[PDB]
């Protein structure tokens, strides 16, 4: 099916405590495969998957060099952005960056992203055509005229339509046994009493992959409920459940519907006492 | 692979 590779970067300033904190992680689909932490002892790019450890030493040398360049730019950016917003040197602030690319079922380029944020709010983002920027604030407007006069989208477009897709195909080829798998959810339902005149039914779905799933309740064929966020199970799979409170005796009217791409046909669960 | 460099704001 479709696949994607993403990179996340975070930088947090620490006034009166030395250098800022830098963290970088890389994800392929829903699986993490690299990480870099400035507070660690190695000061290197470390692998977090079995299929990525078969690369040579030049790969890791290049990765370390480039991530250090990222951190250097982010450390200048913290200062400049503090300058723009008329803020003092007492508080700690955050900058965040994200980019990546998507491929289709034929492993051909579909979309690319590149986004920037300051203190949890959008700052500037590359548009879908990979040639223009979207700046929703006056300071981003100042940045946007500099970036449009200097043709940064040219490097970004070349990278995203080239190297991103090529190495994503390479990674999907290497870690084929893990990255190109689907795990159907092992679903079941429980029942709990809610005093004299009510009960709660809980619909489960455990150990599926990837994280995209849909759990909906239906009473006699009409949509209605408590939903939790898809949570990581800790070993490469995910979990989720949904619950509804029903009047006592009417439990036979409700059904749970599960949709997942690891299933050929959507499953339907009914309460079986 | 990661980018070679990023441009400052």
């Amino acid at each position, epitope marked *: 099916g479709s696949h994607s590779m993403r990179y996340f970067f975070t930088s947090v300033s620490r006034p009166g405590r030395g250098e800022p904190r830098f963290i970088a992680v890389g994800y392929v689909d829903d699986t993490q495969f690299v990480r870099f932490d400035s507070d660690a002892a190695s000061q290197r790019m470390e692998p977090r998957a079995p299929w990525i450890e078969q690369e040579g030493p030049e790969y890791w040398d290049g990765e370390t060099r480039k991530v250090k*360049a990222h951190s*250097q*730019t982010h450390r*200048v950016d913290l200062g*400049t952005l503090r300058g723009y917003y008329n803020q003092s040197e007492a508080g700690s602030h955050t900058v965040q960056r994200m980019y990546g690319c998507d491929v289709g079922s034929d492993w051909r380029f579909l979309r690319g992203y590149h986004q920037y944020a300051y203190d949890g709010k959008d700052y500037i983002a590359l548009k879908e055509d990979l040639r223009s920027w979207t700046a929703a604030d006056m300071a981003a407007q100042t940045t946007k005229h500099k970036w449009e*006069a*200097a*043709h940064v989208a*040219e*490097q970004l477009r*070349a*990278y995203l339509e080239g190297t991103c897709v090529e190495w994503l195909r390479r990674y999907l080829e290497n870690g084929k046994e893990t990255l190109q798998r689907t795990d159907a959810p092992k679903t079941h339902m429980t029942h709990h009493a809610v005093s004299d005149h009510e009960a709660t039914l809980r619909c489960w779905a455990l150990s599926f992959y990837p994280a995209e799933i849909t759990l909906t309740w239906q009473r006699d064929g009409e949509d209605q409920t408590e939903l939790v966020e898809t949570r990581p199970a800790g070993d490469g799979t995910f979990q989720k459940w949904a619950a509804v409170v029903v009047p006592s005796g009417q439990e036979q009217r409700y059904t749970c519907h599960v949709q997942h791409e690891g299933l050929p046909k959507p499953l339907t669960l009914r309460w079986e006492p | 692979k990661v*980018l*070679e*460099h990023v441009v*400052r704001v």
Partner: antibody
Amino acid sequence: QVQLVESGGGLVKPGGSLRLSCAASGFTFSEYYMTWIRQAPGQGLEWVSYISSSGFNIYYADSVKGRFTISRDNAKNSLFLQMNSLRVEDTAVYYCAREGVTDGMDVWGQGTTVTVSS
Amino acid sequence: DIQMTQSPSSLSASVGDRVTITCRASQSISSYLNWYQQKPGKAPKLLIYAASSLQSGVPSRFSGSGSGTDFTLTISSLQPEDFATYYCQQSYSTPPITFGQGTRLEIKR
């Protein structure tokens, strides 16, 4: 280790032609813009040309417009400068400079000497 | 076409003194200023970028400050290997890229 290496500078006559080169190694050549800087004997640095990462935006200095031509080959990591209709005031030492990771130009070549005389 | 003007054009100092060089721009370059250093007969070398940030592998006695149109390079304690020529460059536009005219630093006796 990143580095650049120039070659091609020599002795030429006014109105002649020359072709310089700058071979890169140790980094991805197709993601940085490159420049040509020159320095006359006993003078200061002066910018000459510029070409973007993919090669779509090219700029020249007013003194060399219409006579020089810059280009690049991303597949072989090479940068060229074709100098035509040379004058005596074009005698200098030429450097190729790669852009910096944050600001400036932090990778320079070693320089090649060009002498124009009759 | 932004003109950069250094001052002075030459400055003599002794080992252990405090030095100060200035670079003046024709219009406002908010923080796009880099400083270089050239020993006689070799290629230049970046020292300061973004007008206040120190290049990796440069002794901490160098420092830069300033913004807008008036900038400064300061050396707290001269060493025998600090006598060279220094240039300032703007990164605010293109074309053209322009440098300062240079400032040579010599030994006093």
